[PDB]
Design an enzyme around this catalytic site. Structure first.
Site, PDB file in Angstrom:
ATOM      1  N   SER A  21       0.815  -1.219   0.000  1.00  0.00           N
ATOM      2  CA  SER A  21       0.000   0.000   0.000  1.00  0.00           C
ATOM      3  C   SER A  21       0.852   1.274   0.000  1.00  0.00           C
ATOM      4  CB  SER A  21      -0.962   0.014   1.191  1.00  0.00           C
ATOM      5  OG  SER A  21      -0.548   0.896   2.224  1.00  0.00           O
ATOM      6  N   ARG A  22       0.226   2.403  -0.367  1.00  0.00           N
ATOM      7  CA  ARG A  22       0.814   3.741  -0.357  1.00  0.00           C
ATOM      8  C   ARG A  22      -0.177   4.652   0.366  1.00  0.00           C
ATOM      9  N   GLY A  23       0.322   5.351   1.385  1.00  0.00           N
ATOM     10  CA  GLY A  23      -0.455   6.267   2.209  1.00  0.00           C
ATOM     11  C   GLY A  23       0.266   7.561   2.532  1.00  0.00           C
ATOM     12  N   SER A  25       1.565   8.456   5.471  1.00  0.00           N
ATOM     13  CA  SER A  25       2.718   8.117   6.305  1.00  0.00           C
ATOM     14  C   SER A  25       3.914   7.590   5.472  1.00  0.00           C
ATOM     15  CB  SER A  25       2.311   7.119   7.387  1.00  0.00           C
ATOM     16  OG  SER A  25       3.018   7.377   8.587  1.00  0.00           O
ATOM     17  N   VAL A  28       4.045   1.074   2.183  1.00  0.00           N
ATOM     18  CA  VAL A  28       4.174  -0.231   2.856  1.00  0.00           C
ATOM     19  C   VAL A  28       4.464  -1.305   1.797  1.00  0.00           C
ATOM     20  CG1 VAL A  28       3.320  -1.712   4.742  1.00  0.00           C
ATOM     21  CG2 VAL A  28       2.216   0.509   4.366  1.00  0.00           C
ATOM     22  N   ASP A 133      -3.591  10.108  15.367  1.00  0.00           N
ATOM     23  CA  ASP A 133      -3.889   9.621  14.023  1.00  0.00           C
ATOM     24  C   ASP A 133      -4.770   8.348  13.991  1.00  0.00           C
ATOM     25  OD1 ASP A 133      -3.796   9.941  11.222  1.00  0.00           O
ATOM     26  OD2 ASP A 133      -1.752   9.066  11.007  1.00  0.00           O
TER      27      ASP A 133
END
Ligand SMILES: CN1CCN(CCOc2cc3ncc(-c4cc(N)nc(Cl)c4)n3cc2S(=O)(=O)C(C)(C)C)CC1
Ligand SMILES: CN1CCN(CCOc2cc3ncc(-c4cc(N)nc(Cl)c4)n3cc2S(=O)(=O)C(C)(C)C)CC1
Lengths: 275, 275
Positions: A21-23, A25, A28, A133
Site C-alpha cells: 500500500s501507499r499512504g 505516512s 508499505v 492519528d
C-alpha cells in the site's frame, strides 16, 4: 540506565520486496529478511520524519504497539522495518463483509479492549505519547487477530480522513479518546461513519455543530452485549466538550467487566470462525 | 543511532504478586501493572546477574524472544518484569499427558520451527548472542501457543538439568544446537530424555561416551511426519563432535519444507483441540 540500539538492516538483506500500500505516512512493502528467514513489513530532508517515527516505535514498545525490527538507512534507501501483519487492518475485517461474513462479539470486544490497553500505555509514558492519528486502518491484526497500533507519523510527546478527528482540531490530549469513540462505534455497527454524506466538509460542518454517527436499532442493534454501557462510553467518548471526554483508564475500567463475561475459548472460536 | 531505555517499574505498581515457580534463574511470580492494567510475569553482586539478563532481553528483542516490559530495582526489591505467558512452558505441554492428551503434529512442528527462528536471530546478532541454557521449561507459550524463549541468565555474547548440555562443557558456540536436538527429540517422543537413568552423573558419563536418547519405534513411532528428515536433524544436532553439528540456518532450511505441508487452519484447529 539500560539502553538498546535499534538494529540497522542493509537493503540487500531485504529480498522479495513486493508492494502492499501507499499512504500519507509512506509506502508499505512486504519483504523477507535474508538472514532471519521471516516475512517483514517495510515503510518508505523528509528523512527526519521516518527517523522520528522509528524512534517512537522503539521507545513506545508494548504488547499492542507494532514491533519495529530495525531501520534501513542508506544513501539509496530509507525505510522502517517492522513485523508483518498477516490479517492486515481492522478496516479490512470490519468492511470486507463478503470475505468476513461473520464476526463475533468476543473478538470485537477483545479488539476494543486491546486498542484501549495500547493507547493507555502510550498516555502513561513520561512524557505521555499522543497518537493523534488513530483509524481502523492503523489498528493492525496479527495471525491470531491481536491489535497492533501503527502510524506514529503524526504522534506527539506531551511536554486524509477527518472522521476520527475531534472538531476543535479543525479551525486553528483528548484527541485519541475522540478517535477511539468513532472506532468503537464503527466496530459495533460494522458501518462506515457518515456514509450518507459525500463531501468531507459536510462531515466537518455537522460534527462542529455536535453531530456524530447515528445511534439507533438500525445502526447499533439491541442484541449488542452491554449496549447501554457501550453507548455511554461512545457518547462520552466523542463529547463536543473535550473536558467531558474520559481517560483511557476509565475506558479500561468500564471495559474490564464486559470482557470477563466471555470465556477464553470463545475468542479462539471467533478467530477460527473467520478462517 | 536510535536508542531506547528500559522502563523502571516501582514495586508498588506490581499488584496481586502471587508465586508461580522457583528455579535456578530465580523466582517467577505473577503481578498486575497498576497503571497499564495488564497481567505481567516478574523474575526475582547477585544484582549484577539480573541487570545483565534484563539488558540481554531488551537488546535481543524478537518475535520469538520473551518481551521484557521493564525493571524493578529498589533497595528492598529487584526483579525483571516481562509479558505473562498464559499456557506456561513447552515442558508442561509435553509432559502433562492428562491435561493435554492429544497434541497435533502441525503445532509440534510450528513450535520447533519458532524455537529455531528465535535461536537463529540470536546467533545472527552483532556480536552473536548464545543462549547456553535452552530447556523445554525455557520455551514459553502465549495464549495462542507461540514460542517465547526465556532464561538469558547463562547467555553470552560471542566477541539444574544437564540433559540439554553438550558433553564438552561438563569437565572445566555449538551448545544451542546440541540443546535444540534434545528438545526436538523430546517434542516428537513426548518422553523425558534419559528417563531410565536415576543418577545425573550416569547421564553425564553416558553422553561423554556417545550415548543419546534412544531412537526406535517405541520412542519415536513411524507415524511421525518426515520421521527420516527429523532423525537426520536430531542425530547431526547432538553429534559428539561440535564441528559436526549444524547451524540454526541449516535447521531452518530443512524445517521450512516440512512446515510447507501443513495448512494454516490445522494449527488453529490444533490449539483449539487443547482448550
Ligand atoms: C490487497 N491486500 C492488502 C492487505 N493484505 C496484506 C496485509 O497487509 C498489511 C500488513 C502489514 N503488516 C505491517 C504493516 C504496516 C502498516 C503500517 N501502517 N506501518 C508499518 Cl511500518 C507496517 N502492514 C500493512 C499492510 S497494508 O499496508 O497492506 C494495509 C492496507 C492492510 C494497512 C492482503 C492483500
Ligand atoms: C500448565 N500451566 C501451569 C501454570 N502456568 C502459569 C505460570 O506459568 C508461567 C507463566 C510465565 N509467563 C512469563 C514467565 C517468565 C518465565 C521466565 N523464565 N522469566 C520471566 Cl522474566 C518470566 N512465566 C513463567 C511461568 S512458570 O515459571 O510457572 C513455568 C514453570 C510454567 C515456566 C500456566 C499453565
Amino acid at each position: 540506565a539500560i539502553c538498546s540500539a535499534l538494529p540497522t538492516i542493509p537493503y540487500h538483506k531485504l529480498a522479495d520486496l513486493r508492494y502492499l500500500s501507499r499512504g500519507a505516512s509512506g509506502t508499505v512493502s512486504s519483504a523477507r529478511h535474508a538472514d532471519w528467514r521471516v516475512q517483514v513489513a517495510v515503510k518508505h530532508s523528509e528523512r527526519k520524519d521516518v527517523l522520528r517515527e522509528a524512534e517512537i516505535l522503539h521507545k513506545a514498545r508494548f504488547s499492542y504497539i507494532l514491533p519495529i525490527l530495525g531501520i534501513c538507512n542508506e544513501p539509496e534507501f530509507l525505510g522502517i522495518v517492522t513485523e508483518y501483519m498477516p490479517n492486515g487492518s481492522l478496516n479490512e475485517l470490519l468492511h470486507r463483509k463478503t470475505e468476513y461474513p461473520d464476526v463475533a462479539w468476543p473478538l470485537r470486544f477483545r479488539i476494543l479492549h486491546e486498542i484501549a490497553l495500547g493507547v493507555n500505555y502510550l498516555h502513561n509514558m513520561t512524557p505521555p505519547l499522543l497518537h493523534h492519528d488513530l483509524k481502523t486502518q492503523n489498528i493492525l491484526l496479527d495471525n491470531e487477530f491481536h491489535v497492533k497500533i501503527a502510524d506514529f507519523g503524526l504522534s506527539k510527546w506531551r511536554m486524509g480522513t477527518i472522521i476520527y478527528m475531534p472538531p476543535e482540531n479543525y479551525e486553528p490530549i483528548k484527541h485519541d479518546i475522540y478517535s477511539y469513540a468513532v472506532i468503537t462505534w464503527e466496530v459495533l455497527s460494522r458501518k462506515q461513519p457518515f456514509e450518507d454524506v459525500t463531501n468531507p466538509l459536510q462531515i466537518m460542518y455537522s460534527v462542529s455543530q455536535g453531530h456524530r454517527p447515528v445511534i439507533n436499532e438500525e445502526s447499533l442493534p439491541y442484541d449488542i452485549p452491554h449496549r447501554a454501557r457501550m453507548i455511554s462510553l461512545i457518547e462520552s467518548g466523542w463529547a463536543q466538550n473535550p473536558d467531558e471526554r474520559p481517560s483511557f483508564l476509565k475506558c479500561l475500567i468500564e471495559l474490564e467487566p464486559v470482557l470477563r463475561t466471555f470465556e477464553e475459548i470463545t475468542f479462539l472460536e471467533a478467530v477460527i470462525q473467520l478462517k
